[PDB]
Amino acid sequence: EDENEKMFFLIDKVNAFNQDITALMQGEETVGEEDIRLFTRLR
Amino acid sequence: SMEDLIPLVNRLQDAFSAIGQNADLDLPQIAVVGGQSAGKSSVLENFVGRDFLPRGSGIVTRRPLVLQLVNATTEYAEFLHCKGKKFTDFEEVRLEIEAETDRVTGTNKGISPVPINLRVYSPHVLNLTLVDLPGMTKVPVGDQPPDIEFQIRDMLMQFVTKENCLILAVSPANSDLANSDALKVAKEVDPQGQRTIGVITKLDLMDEGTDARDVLENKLLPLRRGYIGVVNRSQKDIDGKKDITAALAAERKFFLSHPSYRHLADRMGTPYLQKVLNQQLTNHIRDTLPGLRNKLQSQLLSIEKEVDEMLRMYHALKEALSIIGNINTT
Amino acid sequence: SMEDLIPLVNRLQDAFSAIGQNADLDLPQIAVVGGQSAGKSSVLENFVGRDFLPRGSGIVTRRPLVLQLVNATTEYAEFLHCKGKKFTDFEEVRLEIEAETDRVTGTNKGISPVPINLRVYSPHVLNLTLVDLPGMTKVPVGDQPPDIEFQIRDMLMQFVTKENCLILAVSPANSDLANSDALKVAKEVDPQGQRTIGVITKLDLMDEGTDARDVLENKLLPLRRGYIGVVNRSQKDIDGKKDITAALAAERKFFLSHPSYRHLADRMGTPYLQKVLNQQLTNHIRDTLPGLRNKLQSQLLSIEKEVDEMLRMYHALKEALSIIGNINTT
């Protein structure tokens, strides 16, 4: 099915964004080459 | 396999054109080599099926001729150095090619490293590259310098090392048979003889008292395809404009007496050499085709699942894949 | 000086002919450059007075064509590479140029910087050298690389850098004059216009909001020899094979009715444009005249003292000197 095919692309993307949010809340997020994580700058 | 390959190769180029990619099969070239006066031009033109190679007295191949064959509807020829020139008479074509060689070297033992460039269009040919090369020697003749051997030798070596070069190995009787220019080059590139046929020409002129007997019996150094001999046009023959069919007739006479070849008589002649060479050529073409096919599959997929609205790809790619498939199945 | 230029050039060459010496004025060459669909071929060939150059949409001219114009009674052309063939059909001439390109570049849209040599004889020309060049493009075709545009740019740069090359900077009226590909290049190499003659075509189709009034009075962006206005064939026209007489007639008429140009009407058209290009030639011609005179005197002396029995030289030389004087006086 082409309906199934179409479901894979959109449905997969939306979750991945949310998972990174979880990292952001815990001072674990992936950060740029010489940036500092949000949690440390607050301290 | 040669018969089915020919049309498919032209079709494949057309599909490529549509993609707007510079993608070619790069058909392997075939080069004819041999001592001075060997009959080199005779051998080559017999394969092509036409009289177009200059032949003469003394030194015959006096300049290399790099001919590229081009599939086209009309039958004619054109020189790189003669922009725009129209013949239409193939006997005239032969004459013109010959004339250009005389232009630089004369007919007094010659030599020049500068290639003559010729495009021969025909609708029944492969886009191939064939090369007529100056005859290598061991001793100077006429006004050639003492180091004639070294100038000529280098020149032809640049063509025959090219991977997949069917070697028309012609070997002159007026040089020692074990010192064969043809057999040396042929053995260097393709030792097992899948596409090398050792050919000893001009057998009727060999000096009394010499022979290569063990080698020529296919025992000394056994080759799968062995050796096939031929007797090509003699000096009288070239002088007269003796035509193609005629030359083959002289061959028969010699072979019945020579001790080293009578037991292998049924595996002799020009015609038998023809059959073998064609088979190897086909292999190269096919090998390159899988790689392209795969690339095309990958490109299409991406846009389709996200349908990018760049639907133009879909149609272009589909076309290419069909052509590729048919060649792959044979 | 317009009346003096044509006949004096033929007269001087004719005297030279009798001596049998290679003595020419070496009239500077003119090369036409511009984006695709500028009208490049049209401008040049209209000066010559014949339809014989391949003209455009897509990539057409794939090799430069170096044409030498020859004063002669009959109107026809023949190519150096086609000895003996006399074309009487100029459409056939056009076609032949295309075919000749295939010979060297192959038949999948290839290009080569090597010129095809053609001589077009007519009685309405100076013995000059004109050059038709490939247009600038946006998309590749056949086996042309992705950077085809820049390669073609290079090709014309080798002609336009040549000292004394009148650049016919051709610009289509359906694009703004500032965005002209032709004008960009011209301004890069010869910004002040010591050898640039600005030619603006398609006066009847120009987008509203542009005009040539300042340009032709040498006011907006001054050039040494100024600007000559023209109304040439459009892309639609070239496709339809609109002939010379028709284009020329509507062009001249245009300038007489336009409010912005009528008082300057007498320095407009084919007649004036012709005048301008010839005018540049005239300056070079005169300056070169001392050099030849001297050569002729010297030659005589040598052979006579070593008496070659070539006393014919003696008489020939005397003749040349008279002709030279008349050109110097004007």
UniProtKB/Swiss-Prot annotation, chain A:
<comment type="similarity">
    <text>Belongs to the TRAFAC class dynamin-like GTPase superfamily. Dynamin/Fzo/YdjA family.</text>
</comment>
<protein>
    <recommendedName>
        <fullName>Interferon-induced GTP-binding protein Mx1</fullName>
    </recommendedName>
</protein>
<comment type="function">
    <text>Interferon-induced dynamin-like GTPase with antiviral activity against a wide range of RNA viruses and some DNA viruses. Its target viruses include negative-stranded RNA viruses and HBV through binding and inactivation of their ribonucleocapsid. May also antagonize reoviridae and asfarviridae replication. Inhibits thogoto virus (THOV) replication by preventing the nuclear import of viral nucleocapsids. Inhibits La Crosse virus (LACV) replication by sequestering viral nucleoprotein in perinuclear complexes, preventing genome amplification, budding, and egress.</text>
</comment>
<comment type="subunit">
    <text>Homotetramer. Oligomerizes into multimeric filamentous or ring-like structures by virtue of its stalk domain. Oligomerization is critical for GTPase activity, protein stability, and recognition of viral target structures. Interacts with TRPC1, TRPC3, TRPC4, TRPC5, TRPC6 and TRPC7. Interacts with HSPA5. Interacts with DDX39A and DDX39B. Interacts with TUBB/TUBB5. The GTP-bound form interacts (via C-terminus) with THOV P5 protein. The GTP-bound form interacts with LACV protein N. Interacts with CCHFV protein N.</text>
</comment>
From Swiss-Prot, chains B, C:
<feature type="binding site">
    <location>
        <position position="207"/>
    </location>
    <ligand>
        <name>GDP</name>
    </ligand>
</feature>
<feature type="region of interest" description="G5 motif">
    <location>
        <begin position="231"/>
        <end position="234"/>
    </location>
</feature>
<feature type="region of interest" description="G2 motif">
    <location>
        <begin position="60"/>
        <end position="62"/>
    </location>
</feature>
<comment type="similarity">
    <text>Belongs to the TRAFAC class dynamin-like GTPase superfamily. Dynamin/Fzo/YdjA family.</text>
</comment>
<feature type="modified residue" description="Phosphotyrosine">
    <location>
        <position position="76"/>
    </location>
</feature>
<feature type="binding site">
    <location>
        <position position="39"/>
    </location>
    <ligand>
        <name>GDP</name>
    </ligand>
</feature>
<feature type="modified residue" description="Phosphoserine">
    <location>
        <position position="302"/>
    </location>
</feature>
<dbReference type="InterPro" id="IPR001401">
    <property type="entry name" value="Dynamin_GTPase"/>
</dbReference>
<feature type="binding site">
    <location>
        <position position="202"/>
    </location>
    <ligand>
        <name>GDP</name>
    </ligand>
</feature>
<dbReference type="InterPro" id="IPR019762">
    <property type="entry name" value="Dynamin_GTPase_CS"/>
</dbReference>
<feature type="binding site">
    <location>
        <position position="235"/>
    </location>
    <ligand>
        <name>GDP</name>
    </ligand>
</feature>
<dbReference type="InterPro" id="IPR045063">
    <property type="entry name" value="Dynamin_N"/>
</dbReference>
<feature type="binding site">
    <location>
        <position position="37"/>
    </location>
    <ligand>
        <name>GDP</name>
    </ligand>
</feature>
<dbReference type="Pfam" id="PF01031">
    <property type="entry name" value="Dynamin_M"/>
</dbReference>
<dbReference type="InterPro" id="IPR001849">
    <property type="entry name" value="PH_domain"/>
</dbReference>
<feature type="region of interest" description="G1 motif">
    <location>
        <begin position="34"/>
        <end position="41"/>
    </location>
</feature>
<dbReference type="InterPro" id="IPR027417">
    <property type="entry name" value="P-loop_NTPase"/>
</dbReference>
<feature type="region of interest" description="G4 motif">
    <location>
        <begin position="201"/>
        <end position="204"/>
    </location>
</feature>
<feature type="binding site">
    <location>
        <position position="233"/>
    </location>
    <ligand>
        <name>GDP</name>
    </ligand>
</feature>
<dbReference type="InterPro" id="IPR011993">
    <property type="entry name" value="PH-like_dom_sf"/>
</dbReference>
<comment type="subunit">
    <text>Homodimer; homodimerization is mediated by the dynamin-type G domain which promotes assembly-stimulated GTPase activity. Homo-tetramer formed from two dimers in the absence of lipid. Oligomerizes into a helical polymer that self-assembles around the vesicle membrane, when associated to the menbrane through lipid binding.</text>
</comment>
<dbReference type="InterPro" id="IPR022812">
    <property type="entry name" value="Dynamin"/>
</dbReference>
